[model samples]
Target chain A: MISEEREPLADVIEKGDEIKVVAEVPGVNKEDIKVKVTNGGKKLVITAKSEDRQYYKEIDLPAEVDEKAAKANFKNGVLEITLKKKA
Target chain B: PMISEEREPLADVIEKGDEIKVVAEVPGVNKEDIKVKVTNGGKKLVITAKSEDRQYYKEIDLPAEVDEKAAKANFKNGVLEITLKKK
Candidate 1:
């Protein structure tokens, strides 16, 4: 069957004072990725799109985080984001 | 959601005199990310993959005219195979 909707898979981890989110979004470029945190840093939204397809997913954080201190990396179709816990 | 897949989509098109074969590898992407089109009077093969982590776009000028209606495609294990019958 031909389907048009995709909910990219993601993983969340808690490591000491850092929360890490690892997502899989194959067939997209790093430059075309968009990520944001909401709900007072308790939610993560990711969107990646290209000419042929689009991927979107929203993740709920286990704890509040410092959104401004977050960092992300995209490689080999994997997206990794690390956020620091609020002090 | 937990993301456990990985991929860096790549593609290649080959001419075999009587048929044209297009192969693409898109690791973490699902089948929905794959799209193929025979255009320009069947003189061009276009492949596009759009997903969460990768974006792939390629167009190849065919060596001979083809029958777009006779084209076939298959996808398995993140690999795509497309065959075009030449006229």
Candidate 2:
């Protein structure tokens, strides 16, 4: 049996000149997602909080990223984050 | 940090009339990658799904026998809803 309070699943891939991260945060609103880049853009932290559920995760990037140039999208309970590799 | 992709998800079961409903939350998976099976004399339910980097699996014990041919499933917003008719 799965645990009652479980963390969300995610994937990280380095594609072309960008690093892509896809995470599953179900039943959460877009406005509730909290994303942060730390450790000189080599780490990513994601958090989502709602009335009944809370999700938190931290990912290590393959390389440094341009945090300011990152793009994110959420659809159908999935969150996709893309960051350009540092030049 | 937790490897969310390696965890089993929680599921809910409900019996209504001649039908049994199973609901689960599975994130980071495509609809086409999901698999479902009814076995063990229609008293067991197996669900599995795969994504680019994540896998989800769950097994449930049904309360009554069900007709596999009459079962239906729907997936949306990371939630999977399955309905099975009693045999």
Candidate 3:
């Protein structure tokens, strides 16, 4: 995966069996982002394909989550995703 | 208005005489709760959401090309100022 791929700084917040992922893409391209759930719903593959440069980050959540139970709130240059823990 | 919805806090950008000025609000921005970056060859500016408050995120689109080398970012009170020289 060449073509100038850089990982943006990402952080995770775990609270009350739920978690939220925060990734800030300074390059500014929310519509060009692709988020895939992997690793048994415990990981994420995020790719922000801007025209000039790209941002990618594979996040390993602290605990397994419900991949389909996520709510995304992204605006400006930040992507925040929250999901509940899997049973 | 639908009461309130998730959105970018607030931001402003100005092209003043060979310079581009960016300002954003992060309400509870701490002393070191922010990071600045110029991406897309200075076409866009990014600020990390590290505020102490729950609602703080900003991404600015420069009105013109900027010199990434000549940049200054300062966070004070509840707002931030990022100064850049236009290229």
lDDT of 2: 0.83
Candidates 1 and 2 compared: the better one by lDDT is: 2
Candidate 1 residue runs with Cα over 4 Å from true position? A1-3, B1-87
Per-residue lDDT of model 1, residues A1-87, tens digit only: 343757887889999999999987766778889998889979989998766557899999999887788789875567889988889
What TM-score against the true fold does each predicted structure earn? 0.54, 0.63, 0.52
Worst 10 residues of 2 chain A by lDDT: A1-10
How displaced is residue A38 in candidate 1, in Å? 0.3
Per-candidate fnat, comma-separated: 0.12, 0.56, 0.00
Candidates arranged by lDDT, highest first: 2, 1, 3
What are the clashing pairs of model 2?
none
The best candidate in terms of DockQ: 2
- Give the per-residue lDDT of model 2 (tens digit) for A20-45: 99888886778989888889879988
Rank order by DockQ, top first?
A: 2, 1, 3
Alpha-carbon DockQ of candidate 2 = 0.41
Which portions of model 2 miss their true places by more than 4 Å?
A1-5, B1-21, B28-42, B46-59, B66-74, B83-87
The best-first sequence of candidates by TM-score reads 2, 1, 3
Alpha-carbon RMSD, candidate 1: 10.7
Which consecutive 10 residues in model 2 chain B have the weakest lDDT in total? Answer: B1-10
